[PDB]
């Protein structure tokens, strides 16, 4: 049974390595696909810097920090927020990065998160 939060270690990818640059073609689809790939262990994380988002495909899926005191066991608590045409779907804290499919690219680090399911 699905707990409200799940501990995940996400591979951190450099933007130029990413082969599949988004999760789909609408806000609802990208959130759905991101959640599926997170469950399947096939989701990467790109840290946002200048030039990153223009090299990825909208709609974007961000992981954002969802509280201040609780980083259990080393895993920062996060939730998903999508963006399309400058409008965001969810309100949350600071961005940890943008999620993308992972298809075997070599990461530069792993990021521990405690992900809110829905």
Curated annotation (Swiss-Prot):
Region: Disordered, residue numbers: 2-118
Q: Which residues form a coiled coil?
A: none
For the CoV Nsp1 globular domain, which residue ranges apply? Answer: 4-118
Taxonomically, the superkingdom here is Viruses
Question: Cellular location of this protein?
Answer: Host cytoplasm
Role noted for this protein:
Inhibits host translation by associating with the open head conformation of the 40S subunit. The C-terminus binds to and obstructs ribosomal mRNA entry tunnel. Thereby inhibits antiviral response triggered by innate immunity or interferons. The nsp1-40S ribosome complex further induces an endonucleolytic cleavage near the 5'UTR of host mRNAs, targeting them for degradation. This inhibits the integrated stress response (ISR) in the infected cell by preventing EIF2S1/eIF2-alpha phosphorylation upstream of stress granule formation and depletes host G3BP1.
Q: What is this protein called?
A: Host translation inhibitor nsp1
Q: Which organism is it from?
A: Severe acute respiratory syndrome coronavirus 2 (2019-nCoV)
Q: What is the lineage of its organism?
A: Viruses, Riboviria, Orthornavirae, Pisuviricota, Pisoniviricetes
Whichever gene encodes this chain, its name is rep
First and last residues shown, out of full length = 10 to 126 of 7096
């Amino acid at each position: 049974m699905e707990k409200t939060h799940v501990q995940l270690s996400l591979p951190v990818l450099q933007v130029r390595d990413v082969l599949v640059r988004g999760f789909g073609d609408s806000v609802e689809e990208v959130l759905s696909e991101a959640r599926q790939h997170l469950k399947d262990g096939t989701c990467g994380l790109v840290e946002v810097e200048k030039g990153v988002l223009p090299q990825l495909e909208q709609p974007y899926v961000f992981i954002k920090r969802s509280d201040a005191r609780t980083a259990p066991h080393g895993h920062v608590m996060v939730e998903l927020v999508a963006e399309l045409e400058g409008i965001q779907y969810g309100r949350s804290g600071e961005t940890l990065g943008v999620l993308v499919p992972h298809v075997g690219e070599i990461p530069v680090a792993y990021r521990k998160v405690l992900l809110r399911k829905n």
